[PDB]
Structures are given as structure tokens and as C-alpha cells.
Amino acid sequence: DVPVPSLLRGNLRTYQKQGLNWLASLYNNHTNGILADEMGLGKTIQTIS
Amino acid sequence: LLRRLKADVEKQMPAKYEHIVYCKLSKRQRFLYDDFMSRAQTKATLASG
Numbered sequence A: 001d002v003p004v005p006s007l008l009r010g011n012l013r014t015y016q017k018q019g020l021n022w023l024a025s026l027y028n029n030h031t032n033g034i035l036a037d038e039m040g041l042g043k044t045i046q047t048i049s
Numbered sequence B: 001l002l003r004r005l006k007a008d009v010e011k012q013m014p015a016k017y018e019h020i021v022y023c024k025l026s027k028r029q030r031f032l033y034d035d036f037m038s039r040a041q042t043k044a045t046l047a048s049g
């Protein structure tokens, strides 16, 4: 997990940080996955991040 | 895959409660129900159709 807090004026929770950590490796390894997170946790925030 | 639940966000989420409500069918509603059941009996209800 090596996030860049630039352009991230909003606040994201710890599990959101874990989610983006998981998501970054998918792009780094050129792989695609399903983000089947429970609704209401801020998935749009994960996409924006 | 990537899946999470509300148990990770628990201890702060207000509890959710489910209630079952029973409503008696109206007199005209009951009559229409029985009439349609009888008509479907004349139609064999198309159960195996």
C-alpha cells in the first residue's frame, strides 16, 4: 500500500484504505477483479481514490 | 474477488430491525380471491401448463 494523498481532499476510512490497497495491486499486475464490497461502505470513494 | 461486510464497520452502525405486519384481507378482497380461485379451477389453474 503506497498511496498518494494528492487530490484527496476528502477523508477515507481504514477499510477504505485497505480496499484501495487491494485495488492498486490489480492495476499494477494488469489484472481485473470484482469489487463485491457491501453496499454503503463508500465504493464510489474507492473508485475516486 | 474482494468482499467486505458491515461487521468490519460495526460497533458504530445503528442496529437494524425487521418487523412482520399481518393484514386481514377485506371482505370484497376475500370474495374476489375466492371467485378467481374458482375461475382458475374452471381453468384448471394452469398449474401444470
Ligand SMILES: Nc1ncnc2c1ncn2[C@@H]1O[C@H](COP(=O)(O)OP(=O)(O)O)[C@@H](O)[C@H]1O
Residues within 6 Å of the ligand: A010, A011, A012, A013, A038, A039, A040, A041, A042, A043, A044, A045
Ligand atoms: N470517507 C467518507 N466521508 C464522508 N462520506 C462518505 C465517506 N465514504 C462514504 N461516504 C458516503 O457513503 C456513500 C457511499 O455511496 P457509494 O460509494 O456511491 O455506494 P455504496 O453506498 O455502495 O458505498 C456516499 O453517498 C458518501 O456520501
Ligand SMILES: [Mg+2]
Residues within 6 Å of the ligand: A042, A043, A044, A045
Ligand atoms: Mg457507490
